[PDB]
Design a protein around this nucleic acid. Structure first.
Ligand SMILES: [K+]
Ligand SMILES: [Mg+2]
Ligand SMILES: [Mg+2]
Ligand SMILES: [Mg+2]
Ligand SMILES: [Mg+2]
Length: 191
RNA sequence: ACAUUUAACUAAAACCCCUACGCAUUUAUAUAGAGGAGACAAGUCGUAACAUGGUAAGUGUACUGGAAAGUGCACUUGGACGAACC
């Protein structure tokens, strides 16, 4: 998270690859020499590219710093590209009541619907002996509620010496969805 | 609706009406189904309250929500503010 704003007269790094306001490459210069050009022409320096190992800073007028972000405000509006995926977690118990399982199963539908990743964990019920046969039958029982909407990303594993099972769900991908749709029609319509 | 008749040298005889009660009305029981409260017990999800209970609590009202509840507006103390200046 950054913004196209002036860095000020406090530079952390001694050597900077300074750039002119008109786009000319002034070349690497000492940190002190950078501030002299900020006063001689009353200009503010903005870090254009952080990624490069050599520091890159461009000195431009305040009006030029307004037009720049005014364009980053349109490019993102025109073509927004926010793809981070949130991860949600649930920790159930083998002996979880159905009423609580329908409440937690409806919460997974809201997350899936928001393209989130739902990590579900199941643990042995309080002083209850149970294997992994019916302890893994809760995932299939939750996934069934979301037939086409959801699919496994990971699969059940013995996270803690078998006393727990962990799975991760995701919203079905567009292509996968279309494939599911196609299959659904054949079973009923063709018959 | 219904009618003064016979009789009368002692005096008597004769008498006999038709309409109501209902698909009205009162109350209660029984029955499909739905839903409360309580006892027993203390499974499931949380942790709402009691300590400034971890966002002080509560009243009334409104909206909202798996659930205790949450929030807004006004009100209360059945909260507090540490009690000389500095
Ligand atoms: K409260
Ligand atoms: Mg509490
Ligand atoms: Mg509280
Ligand atoms: Mg209140
Ligand atoms: Mg709310």
């Amino acid at each position: 998270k950054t913004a196209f704003s002036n860095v000020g007269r406090k530079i952390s790094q001694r050597v900077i690859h300074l750039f002119d306001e008109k786009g000319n490459d002034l070349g690497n210069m000492h940190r002190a020499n950078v501030i002299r050009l900020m006063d001689e022409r009353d200009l503010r320096l903005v870090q254009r590219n952080t990624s490069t190992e050599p520091a890159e800073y461009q000195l431009m007028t305040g009006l030029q710093i307004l037009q720049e972000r005014q364009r980053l405000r349109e490019m993102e509006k025109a073509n927004p590209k926010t793809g981070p995926t949130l991860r949600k977690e649930l920790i159930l118990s083998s002996n979880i009541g159905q009423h609580d399982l329908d409440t937690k199963t409806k919460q997974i539908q809201q997350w899936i619907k928001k393209k989130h990743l739902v990590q579900i964990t199941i643990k042995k019920g309080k002083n209850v002996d149970v294997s992994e046969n019916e302890m893994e039958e809760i995932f299939h029982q939750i996934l069934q509620t979301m037939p086409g909407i959801a699919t496994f990303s990971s699969r059940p594993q013995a996270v803690q010496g078998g006393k727990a099972l962990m799975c991760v769900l995701r919203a079905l991908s567009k292509n996968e969805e279309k494939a599911y749709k196609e299959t659904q029609e054949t079973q009923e319509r063709d018959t």
